[PDB]
Amino acid sequence: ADQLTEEQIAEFKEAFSLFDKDGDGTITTKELGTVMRSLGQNPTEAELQDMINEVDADGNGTIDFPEFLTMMARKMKDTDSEEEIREAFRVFDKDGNGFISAAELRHVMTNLGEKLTDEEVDEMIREADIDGDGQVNYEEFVTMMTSK
Amino acid sequence: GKPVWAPHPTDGFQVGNIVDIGPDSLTIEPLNQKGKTFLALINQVFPAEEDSKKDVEDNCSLMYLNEATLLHNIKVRYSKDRIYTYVANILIAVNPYFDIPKIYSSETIKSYQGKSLGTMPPHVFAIADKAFRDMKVLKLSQSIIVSGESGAGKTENTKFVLRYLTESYGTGQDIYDRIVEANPLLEAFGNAKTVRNNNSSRFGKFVEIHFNEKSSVVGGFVSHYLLEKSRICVQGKEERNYHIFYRLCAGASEDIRERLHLSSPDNFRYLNRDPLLDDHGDFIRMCTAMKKIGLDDEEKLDLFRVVAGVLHLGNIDFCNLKNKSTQALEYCAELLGLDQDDLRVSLTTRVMVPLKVEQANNARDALAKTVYSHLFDHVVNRVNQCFPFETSSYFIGVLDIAGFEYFEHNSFEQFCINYCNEKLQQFFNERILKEEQELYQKEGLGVNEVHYVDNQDCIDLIEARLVGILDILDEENRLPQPSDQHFTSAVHQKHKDHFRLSIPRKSKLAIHRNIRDDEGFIIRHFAGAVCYETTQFVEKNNDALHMSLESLICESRDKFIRELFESLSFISVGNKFKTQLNLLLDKLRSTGASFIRCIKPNLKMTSHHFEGAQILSQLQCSGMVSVLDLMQGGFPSRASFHELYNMYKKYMPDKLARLDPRLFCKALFKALGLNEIDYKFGLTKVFFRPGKFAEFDQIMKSDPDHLAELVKRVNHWLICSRWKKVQWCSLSVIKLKNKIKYRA
Numbered sequence: 025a026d027q028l029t030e031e032q033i034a035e036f037k038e039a040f041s042l043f044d045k046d047g048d049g050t051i052t053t054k055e056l057g058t059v060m061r062s063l064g065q066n067p068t069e070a071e072l073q074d075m076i077n078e079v080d081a082d083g084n085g086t087i088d089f090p091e092f093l094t095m096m097a098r099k100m101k102d103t104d105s106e107e108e109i110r111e112a113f114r115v116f117d118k119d120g121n122g123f124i125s126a127a128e129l130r131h132v133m134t135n136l137g138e139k140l141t142d143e144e145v146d147e148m149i150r151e152a153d154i155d156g157d158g159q160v161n162y163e164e165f166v167t168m169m170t171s172k
Numbered sequence: 173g174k175p176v177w178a179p180h181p182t183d184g185f186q187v188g189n190i191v192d193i194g195p196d197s198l199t200i201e202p203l204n205q206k207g208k209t210f211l212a213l214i215n216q217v218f219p220a221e222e223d224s225k226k227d228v229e230d231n232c233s234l235m236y237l238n239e240a241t242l243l244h245n246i247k248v249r250y251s252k253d254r255i256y257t258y259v260a261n262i263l264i265a266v267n268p269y270f271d272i273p274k275i276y277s278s279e280t281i282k283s284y285q286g287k288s289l290g291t292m293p294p295h296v297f298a299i300a301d302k303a304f305r306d307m308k309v310l311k312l313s314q315s316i317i318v319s320g321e322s323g324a325g326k327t328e329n330t331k332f333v334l335r336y337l338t339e340s341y342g343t344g345q346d347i348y349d350r351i352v353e354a355n356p357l358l359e360a361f362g363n364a365k366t367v368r369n370n371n372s373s374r375f376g377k378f379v380e381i382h383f384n385e386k387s388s389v390v391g392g393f394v395s396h397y398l399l400e401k402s403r404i405c406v407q408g409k410e411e412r413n414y415h416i417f418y419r420l421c422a423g424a425s426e427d428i429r430e431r432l433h434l435s436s437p438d439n440f441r442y443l444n445r446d447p448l449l450d451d452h453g454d455f456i457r458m459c460t461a462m463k464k465i466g467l468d469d470e471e472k473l474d475l476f477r478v479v480a481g482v483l484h485l486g487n488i489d490f491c492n493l494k495n496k497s498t499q500a501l502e503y504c505a506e507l508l509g510l511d512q513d514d515l516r517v518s519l520t521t522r523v524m525v526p527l528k529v530e531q532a533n534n535a536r537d538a539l540a541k542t543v544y545s546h547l548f549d550h551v552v553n554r555v556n557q558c559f560p561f562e563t564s565s566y567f568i569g570v571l572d573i574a575g576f577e578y579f580e581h582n583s584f585e586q587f588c589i590n591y592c593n594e595k596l597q598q599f600f601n602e603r604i605l606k607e608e609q610e611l612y613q614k615e616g617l618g619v620n621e622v623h624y625v626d627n628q629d630c631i632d633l634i635e636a637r638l639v640g641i642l643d644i645l646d647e648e649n650r651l652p653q654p655s656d657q658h659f660t661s662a663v664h665q666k667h668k669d670h671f672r673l674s675i676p677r678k679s680k681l682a683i684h685r686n687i688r689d690d691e692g693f694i695i696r697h698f699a700g701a702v703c704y705e706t707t708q709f710v711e712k713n714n715d716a717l718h719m720s721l722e723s724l725i726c727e728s729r730d731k732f733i734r735e736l737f738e739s740l741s742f743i744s745v746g747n748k749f750k751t752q753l754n755l756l757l758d759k760l761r762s763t764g765a766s767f768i769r770c771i772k773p774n775l776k777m778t779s780h781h782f783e784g785a786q787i788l789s790q791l792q793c794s795g796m797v798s799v800l801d802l803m804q805g806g807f808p809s810r811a812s813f814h815e816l817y818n819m820y821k822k823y824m825p826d827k828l829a830r831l832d833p834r835l836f837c838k839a840l841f842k843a844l845g846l847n848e849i850d851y852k853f854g855l856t857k858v859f860f861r862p863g864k865f866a867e868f869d870q871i872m873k874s875d876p877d878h879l880a881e882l883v884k885r886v887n888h889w890l891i892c893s894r895w896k897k898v899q900w901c902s903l904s905v906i907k908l909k910n911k912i913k914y915r916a
């Protein structure tokens with residue numbers, strides 16, 4: 025897309041491989057829903073169909089990364105950008121206490137098909153844990169999200 | 173040092189060790205035989221795969237893609253009954269010469285529906301499916317070009333394409349069945365047993381499946397090229413005439429073979445010069461196909477009569493007719509609805525006057541060929557009437573025509589076929605170049621300096637107006653006293669300086685130097701020099717039946733016999749084909765095109781008998797080595813993240829081996845510091861420059877501790893990537909659910 029920076033597009037490309045598990049560079053509605061459900065959403069097939077029809081220029085029913093990029097695009101009031109990050113965090117912080125715990129990270133990773141050990145989950149937490157309290161808060165989550 | 177591939181006179185290549193380097197050539201020691209040595213040109217010796225037992229589905233997965241590693245790869249696959257292999261998008265298919273289990277089953281067909289090349293093992297089905305998907309998605313007609321020498325499997329792989337499409341995308345559509353049931357009919361009139369193939373196609377064909385705007389089949393069309401005329405009257409020691417003759421002689425009802433005065437094939441001259449050939453059963457299979465496409469019993473009879481007519485015409489012996497023949501002539505003139513007198517008159521006398529034995533023979537055969545050839549024209553056209561259409565939006569076209577191959581004596585027929593393959597080869601070069609450019613652009617690989625050099629000058633030599641060989645030939649047919657020798661001199665004088673033309677006596681081969689300058693020429697075809705003996709070029713360039721004989725048959729008693737002919741007596745065979753060939757390229761050039769290279773593994777029709785030198789020659793002749801050279805200019809080694817991950821996860825720390833393939837490979841690039849020049853982390857694959865894959869392979873195989881070390885130095889970065897992957901995925905799901913709202 026043209027509203028996204030180089031950095032931003034790079035991160036989504038990586039995020040995209042999570043839908044595109046087979047690594048052929050294209051996803052269908054099947055893979056769109058599976059991932060969305062894994063992150064606590066639940067679109068109806070009709071809803072996916074409608075959304076995918078905007079960017080699916082051919083009739084194939086499958087899309088690729090740049091079509092994906094535009095499928096995520098929309099008109100946003102300033103408040104919407106931060107509201108979204110704030111809400112992604114709350115996908116991790118499942119109990120709303122303001123801190124992502126190791127058990128919680130573990131929940132998201134395993135939900136997304138990521139394979140890692142408990143020790144490695146602790147490591148992930150530790151590396152994001154800037155203030156050293158052993159969990160991840162909002163500011164720390166944002167910092168990690170936007171860092172090369 | 174490391175074993176390498178070097179030339180071998182019967183295996184094509186053999187393993188050996190370089191024992192000595194020279195400025196021009198290398199000294200090789202064949203693996204087995206210490207003390208033995210031989211020389212090979214430096215450019216004829218090739219690096220080998222470390223693992224001589226592995227096999228890959230796409231030759232681009234090889235560490236070293238070259239004619240030797242390619243030959244060896246398909247060889248291992250073929251030994252395990254895997255006859256299909258890719259070179260990027262090109263399908264190589266090696267004739268197995270026996271029926272391999274499961275590979276062509278209806279179930280196996282289902283497993284290919286909708287799948288991209290690479291997601292299943294290489295297969296003719298994948299190529300068929302891709303033509304249909306590109307048609308439907310790209311809104312662009314599609315061609316699948318199936319080439320190879322006689323016996324290589326072009327006709328079989330063409331049937332597999334039609335079968336796959338019919339079962340996959342034509343369930344309720346009978347048009348598909350009429351198209352599938354067409355080939356049995358064509359094969360009867362156009363195929364024949366030769367020493368190279370028991371079911372050799374004696375004509376070229378293009379099969380078009382036509383579609384409407386909704387990928388629904390609306391009709392079909394069949395183009396046929398270069399029917400082998402000479403086979404109608406005389407055939408080689410160990411060959412036969414067209415199937416239909418023997419099929420009708422061994423399958424006709426007691427009644428019919430009585431109405432048509434038919435006996436065993438041994439009773440006819442045209443069949444005189446059959447254990448594995450089920451003429452009887454094939455007759456039955458043919459009649460089935462006729463009912464299946466809509467031939468009435470009357471047409472079936474009309475065709476048969478003419479076939480029979482032609483048979484008796486060949487029995488008439490000579491002067492005038494003996495008595496053995498007056499029964500033949502009687503039968504003949506009755507089946508072709510002719511006046512027994514005018515016929516005998518026409519076979520024995522000419523207007524310019526009496527005829528010798530020879531001249532009466534030529535006139536009998538000439539008429540026979542013309543009748544049969546028109547019969548065949550009528551048949552192919554009949555087939556097109558089983559699925560006509562006034563309009564359509566797209567087609568999928570499958571080309572089934574004989575490639576370049578070696579003959580002891582090259583006459584006009586080889587000249588036409590080699591002309592054809594020059595133009596197809598050009599098309600093929602153009603197309604592989606475009607795919608490669610397209611790939612390099614999609615993945616950011618840059619430029620490739622390597623370019624196939626054009627063969628347009630060779631094509632022009634043959635086909636250019638006024639000065640091309642075909643026009644020079646036509647002039648000769650129009651001269652008062654046409655001569656093969658005068659023709660040949662005309663060509664030499666006109667093209668004395670042509671890069672592509674040579675005089676036979678310049679050859680390194682003594683048998684060619686024996687040919688006088690005005691009796692042949694050598695043309696430097698794409699695949700190599702071909703020495704043409706031009707004797708008979710003038711006669712063979714002529715499809716026209718003498719006026720007297722043609723009148724006899726045009727004004728005939730039988731309406732069907734007259735309808736075959738609804739069309740100086742000269743019709744140029746060369747130029748007629750030129751026009752057909754040019755129409756065919758117009759169509760191909762408007763399509764997206766795929767290529768199936770059929771390889772005949774040996775000259776004995778046996779299974780599991782890989783003749784390396786014979787196969788290497790087909791790979792070379794069919795342009796494949798040309799492709800490998802193009803690939804060497806850029807990134808000839810291409811591996812998916814998945815493929816790399818399975819190959820190398822075992823050499824990495826368990827913590828890394830736990831990542832997904834994409835992130836695994838991404839980590840290897842970072843930990844190894846791989847130079848962006850040599851290595852390209854693509855959209856879905858890693859692209860390596862020549863040698864760089866083998867180099868990366870050595871790195872993975874080096875000191876495990878140091879490797880773990882490199883990975884550790886990149887740990888913070890890896891953990892961050894993993895955070896970002898899941899974090900941004902999360903933002904993604906959210907932006908998506910917000911879009912679902914936005915649209916309501």
Ligand SMILES: Nc1ncnc2c1ncn2[C@@H]1O[C@H](COP(=O)(O)OP(=O)(O)O)[C@@H](O)[C@H]1O
Binds near residue numbers: 327
């Ligand atoms: N894939 C295959 N499976 C089984 N038999 C095959 C296959 N390809 C070819 N054959 C055998 O080889 C013979 C010649 O193949 P064909 O398609 O006629 O070659 P071409 O059309 O290239 O002259 C066929 O009659 C068949 O016996």
Ligand code: BEF
Binds near residue numbers: 321326327372374574
């Ligand atoms: F002989 Be095959 F038909 F080319």
Ligand SMILES: [Ca+2]
Binds near residue numbers: 044046047049050052
């Ligand atoms: Ca996919």
Ligand SMILES: [Ca+2]
Binds near residue numbers: 079081084086
């Ligand atoms: Ca799409």
Ligand SMILES: [Ca+2]
Binds near residue numbers: 116117121122124
């Ligand atoms: Ca929490």
Ligand SMILES: [Ca+2]
Binds near residue numbers: 154155156
């Ligand atoms: Ca913290």
Ligand SMILES: [Mg+2]
Binds near residue numbers: 326371
């Ligand atoms: Mg054939």
